[PDB]
Amino acid sequence: LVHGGPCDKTSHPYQAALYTSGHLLCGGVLIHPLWVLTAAHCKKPNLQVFLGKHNLGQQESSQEQSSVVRAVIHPDYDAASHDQDIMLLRLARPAKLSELIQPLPLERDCSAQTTSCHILGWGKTADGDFPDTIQCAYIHLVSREECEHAYPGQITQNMLCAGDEKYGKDSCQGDSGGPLVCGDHLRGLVSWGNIPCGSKEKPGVYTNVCRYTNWIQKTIQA
Ligand SMILES: COc1ccc2ccc(S(=O)(=O)N(Cc3ccsc3)[C@@H]3CCN(Cc4csc(C(=N)N)c4)C3=O)cc2c1
């Protein structure tokens, strides 16, 4: 993500890193000891999920590595538009919870008031490189009508927009599936946005997690 800075070490216990073939693929969010939420467009074979990570180059005493035994994309995911861009990953071994590994509660209320949020990830930074250390930035939800003007005809009820007019803080390539956190609840997942990245005129677009409460519960419960 661009124009942010390194997260406080203790502030992102829910953040997941997704790898395939030994390389960073996407972000993700721990929502249950057994389940990680990420973007549908992240689906690949041989996924490895890392929890409790802060710096990707280090072997951190807090980190846990797990394979996935089940990857459940939403049935109605549309690759072209990123509509319904959400996937549940069933961890092969339950998260060893600690100070630095904790699930994040979902925002189940689509009418939730809090518009001050933050995003996190190991995706591309403003200099065009990929950071070792996880980045964080404060951004704000943008009203649906604001965002529809930004991407006329292309924004569904399954999408949320968020950005920062002052610095243009924004998620970027490699941040997919990472948490948009508002009021300390999971409000969205990094889905798509402007390229080059930066939200000064076009906000980032996020999967509207509140819409998927039932589908998540049914899947975890199956
Ligand atoms: C993790 O390492 C890489 C390395 C090179 C990359 C080149 C392109 C992209 S991408 O932008 O096209 N990407 C495709 C993808 C990534 C993992 S699985 C498929 C998606 C496309 C949506 N997205 C987030 C995003 C792009 S711009 C943006 C924003 N808020 N402005 C957010 C991505 O990162 C992602 C890349 C990720």
Query: Which of 1, 25, 173 is the pocket-test mutation for ligand 1 (most atoms within 8 Å of CB)?
Result: 173
**Is there a catalytic annotation at residue 12?**
no
Cα separation, 124 vs 185, whole angstroms: 24
Read off the amino acid at residue 140.
H
Spelled out in words, what is the top-level CATH class assigned to the domain 1-12+104-210? mainly beta
**Is there a catalytic annotation at residue 85?**
yes
State in Å: Cα 125 to ligand 1 middle.
12
Which of 66, 74, 164, 176 is the catalytic position?
Answer: 176
Token pair 């999408």: residue: 159
Cα separation, 26 vs 71, whole angstroms: 14
Q: Taking a C-beta distance cutoff of 8 angstroms, is the pair 3, 128 a contact?
A: no
Domain chopping of the chain, boundaries: 1-12+104-210, 13-103+211-222
Pocket of ligand 1 contains residue 194 by CB under 6 Å: yes
**Is there a catalytic annotation at residue 61?**
no
CA atoms within 13 A on the CB side of 172: 25
- Provide CB contacts within 8 A for 31, sequence distance 6+: 14, 37, 103, 104, 105, 106, 186, 216
Cα separation, 18 vs 42, whole angstroms: 9
Pick the CATH number of 13-103+211-222 from 2.40.10.10, 3.40.50.1000, 3.65.10.10, 3.40.190.10: 2.40.10.10
Would 1-12+104-210 and 13-103+211-222 be classified into the same CATH topology?
Answer: yes
Other C-beta atoms within 10 Å of 202: how many? 20
Q: Which residues pair with 160 in a beta bridge?
A: 206
Element (H, E) at 131: none
This structure's resolution (Å) is 1.9
Provide Rg for the chain, Cα atoms: 16
State in Å: Cα 222 to ligand 1 middle.
31
